[PDB]
Design a binder for this molecule. Structure first.
Ligand SMILES: [Zn+2]
Ligand SMILES: [Zn+2]
Lengths: 283, 58, 92, 52, 286
């Protein structure tokens, strides 16, 4: 059994085959439905796991993603996610295959274009072929994924009080706030996706309220989410894999054998986390 | 299993009104046997046919 | 029977599906009058008939029995016969 | 003859590997080794029951 | 050697599944520069020969086409070949492969081709990569082919006389018709396609005429070729005409019965029920 939405992706013709397929995790159950391959490919992110002490080494764990954006690029190039307000502006959908553009119109509820292209395809030979039933199978899949209640299961729980606020804790980080109001207006599938991705800064428990990083990684953004440090210069995001300058005015660095001397010491990884706001959980 | 088992196997023969399903099954069996003798999925003289004898005296 | 009610029988056979011969028949078959698909899958159909020009009834059939395009809908029929079918189909 | 065969080129096959393996597992327990000799004996009996 | 325009066509993609159907037409020699596969795909037509009759063995038979438009098709559906003003709407460009679209642009000879695509590709990884090389190479080959088709100038392939005519008399005789204007607007390539495809209903031999159909098959519009006739309804379109299966035929009592109704009829010649494209007029002179 396999679940990645990008493995559910199909191509209308043998050429333009949807090759370079999903990461094998597509056989897993994760509730991302994106394979990590596609998550890298489309949005410059890679998912990750917080190990939580279950009051113990006992299993408590939470999902995370690092972003893969660089330190120099700005605006749209920093954008992580769009709104329907701008999803076409970000994707340049025409470059994309027709089923991809279709599925984006699904996510952003562009029923107009959806039905337009559906009606155009009806009489095409390849849509008298069961491409219709394929696309509506994808539809049904999403329908199940939101049959789990899009508001009630996702957040409007009867344990309603166990809420995530993604608003910035800092009272001076005032560009946040109504970003949480936007969150309600993003489609619930995406709300759930965020609820996966984003580590809280804090959690209230009946045990205690507790604090996990000093300061927030980014902020909520007014179209879709962006590499959005609350203040100051963008933090150096390194990159792990044309007639331009690439000067790096390095220190001379003659202290050879450094690694053979020090390697036992903790080799601090750098990839940016996703602390944001306050979760609440009963007991 | 592909062959539209509307009925359990035995029911088929417990009926005698049909010949269709019976001859189909038989032909498929012969195909499988020949295939196991010959790693070459194939077809033959493309006319053959069958009769169910129905009397002890036949 | 379309309407009338049976009398005078003293014993009955219970329905069983095997009774319904799927006549292989000729490839082309042409039929006329009211037609109601009982099951496209099983090639089952119902057709109007009268005996002696005066005895309205419906005839079950199963097989090729291809007919005019004018497929009619189960909706239209009498509750009487509809109940009758509902049991006799025995989808249970 | 009681039937025609179209008798043109036809072969059936199926490929639902997972399905087939599911079948295999369901089948696993049976000591068929034992169980089928009696079947062969059935055919034997029938060989003479064929005639009185 | 290959000569189909479409054998040129290849594009950057993950795909290793390019579906090029290009028929024997590529290595045949009749200057269509397009395989019947595409005559089908885009243009819903079939190549034919008129067996031009001659008492001499030199029958000197002639190229022809016939269209495949279904009788049920309406308007744009019956439009065979749009004008530059209409093609972009007529065809699902973006669904069609990128380079194919671009090629269509160039066939229309629009600057907008380079205005748009040549810029738009900039961002693409393939534009960044050597594949830019292959892309522009195939482009240049296409340009060369177009220049070979170019009639416009004496420093070019085509020269001297012309004697075909079109815009033939309407029954209701509405004045004139810009069909030569459209003809000239169309690339000489398209004009050669018309020459390949379109029979005239009359040929005037130098000092003699012959006529071959009562009436024209096709009509022309400023927007494009119309698969229609002035009058009545559209003629009946000649309709487009191994695994195990459950349906296995029953025995029949081993009889052939009346062969006649098929036998003698098949002995009689069966009509070539097709829609040859007659539209226009031809003349000859010593
Ligand atoms: Zn995927
Ligand atoms: Zn070609």
């Amino acid at each position: 059994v396999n679940r990645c939405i990008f493995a559910s992706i199909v191509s209308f013709d043998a050429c333009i085959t949807y090759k370079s397929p999903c990461s094998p995790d597509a056989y897993h159950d994760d509730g991302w439905f994106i394979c990590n391959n596609h998550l890298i490919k489309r949005f410059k992110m890679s998912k990750m796991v917080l190990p939580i002490f279950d009051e113990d080494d006992n299993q408590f764990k939470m999902t995370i993603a690092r972003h893969l954006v660089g330190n120099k690029e700005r605006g749209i190039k920093r954008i992580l996610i769009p709104s329907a307000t701008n999803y076409q502006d970000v994707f340049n959908l025409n470059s994309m295959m027709q089923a991809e553009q279709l599925i984006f119109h699904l996510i952003y509820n562009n029923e107009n274009a959806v039905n337009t292209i559906c009606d155009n395809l009806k009489y095409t030979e390849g849509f008298t072929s069961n491409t219709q039933r394929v696309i509506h199978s994808v539809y049904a899949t999403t329908k199940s994924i939101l049959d789990t209640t899009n508001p009630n299961t996702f957040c409007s729980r009867v344990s309603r009080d166990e809420l995530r606020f993604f608003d910035v804790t800092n009272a001076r980080a005032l560009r946040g706030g109504a970003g949480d109001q936007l969150f309600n207006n993003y489609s619930g599938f995406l709300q759930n996706l965020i609820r996966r991705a984003v580590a809280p800064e804090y959690l209230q428990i009946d045990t205690e309220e507790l604090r996990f990083r000093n300061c927030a990684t980014c902020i909520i953004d007014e179209t879709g989410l962006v590499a959005s440090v609350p203040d100051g210069p963008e933090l150096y995001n390194p990159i792990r894999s044309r007639l331009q300058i690439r000067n790096v005015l390095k220190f001379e660095g003659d202290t050879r054998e450094l690694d053979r001397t020090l390697s036992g010491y903790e080799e601090y990884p750098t990839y940016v986390p996703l602390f944001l706001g306050y979760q609440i959980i009963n007991s | 299993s592909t062959l539209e088992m509307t009925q359990p196997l035995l029911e088929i023969f417990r009926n005698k009104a049909d010949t269709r399903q019976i001859a189909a099954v038989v032909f498929s069996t012969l195909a499988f046997i020949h295939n196991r003798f010959h790693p070459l999925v194939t077809n033959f003289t493309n006319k053959m046919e069958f009769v169910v004898t129905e009397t002890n005296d036949t | 029977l379309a309407v009338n009610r049976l009398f005078g029988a003293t014993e009955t056979i219970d329905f069983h599906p095997n009774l319904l011969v799927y006549r292989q028949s000729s490839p082309p078959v042409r039929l006329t009058g009211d037609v109601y698909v009982v099951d496209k899958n099983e090639k089952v159909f119902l057709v109007k008939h009268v005996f002696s020009n005066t005895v309205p009834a419906y005839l079950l059939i199963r097989g090729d029995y291809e007919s005019s395009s004018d497929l009619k809908s189960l909706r239209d029929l009498n509750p009487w016969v509809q109940n009758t079918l509902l049991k006799l189909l025995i989808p249970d | 003859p009681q039937q025609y065969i179209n008798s043109g080129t036809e072969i059936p096959f199926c490929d639902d590997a997972e399905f087939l393996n599911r079948l295999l597992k369901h089948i696993d327990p049976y000591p068929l080794s034992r169980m089928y000799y009696n079947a062969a004996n059935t055919m034997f009996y029938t060989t003479m029951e064929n005639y009185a």
